[PDB]
Amino acid sequence: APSEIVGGVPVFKPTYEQFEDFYAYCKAINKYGMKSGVVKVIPPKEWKDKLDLPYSAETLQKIKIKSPIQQHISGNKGLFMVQNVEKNKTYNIIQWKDLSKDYVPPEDSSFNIDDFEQFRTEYTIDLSDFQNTERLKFLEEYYWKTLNFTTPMYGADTPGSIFPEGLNVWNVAKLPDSYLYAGLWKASFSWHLEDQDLYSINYIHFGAPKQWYSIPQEDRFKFYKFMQEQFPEEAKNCPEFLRHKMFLASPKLLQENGIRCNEIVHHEGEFMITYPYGYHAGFNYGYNLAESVNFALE
């Protein structure tokens, strides 16, 4: 199996025949993902058909977004650090979709099983705006400029799954323990490797795309050292401080420091796979719901 294209990041678009087996397809593809930080995998149609949309009323209901996170991001130019502070509230998908009305991208009581049944036509967001490359570019530029002006909110690490219970192909929830990611515009994930240096799949079920950045394994030593130049204090005692604190570095910056930085856009109905020793970070282009798990190939 070869890659179909590159955005700096390999893009694989296999037939259902090869995509069929998750551990075989990941075993045959590991060499590419072990060079670049991440890898995109666009699934065949025979896969999509296996999905049940719109999600049943109950499914849309089981979605609980507990302890939302608000991020105060402090920094000047390409160098920022976030401090997560939790809200004790918990949201449902409808409240979340509503909440996203306060987190708009720049231009240029009690609920009932009936409410979610009504919501089966209202759960998605318009996407004819994220097709424009210049639009995405514009947003990303605004994102980095205005990082420290607003505090974004992220419904991250919320246990659950909206994959079909009987889906036995590439089902994040059940692999041979998954979490949902309720995204809002400007919600960010800082630079990091996975716990115990595992892999991870990330599939967007619906909503706005994500911006991804990764460090080619080759340059992870340059990267780690540079991030020591910066944030000298945080680096002092702690050897694994990138796993401790939340730092944000822009590609443009890293690039102009000898550090290669991959970048790609992650759309709904697509998988991102991160690999051991592949640093990654980014943000969400708006309201969305994703699902992910850490895993190993041995």
Ligand SMILES: O=C(O)CCC(=O)C(=O)O
């Ligand atoms: O979706 C996120 O918030 C961060 C990305 C991530 O943790 C992953 O899927 O590996």
Ligand code: NI
């Ligand atoms: Ni990750």
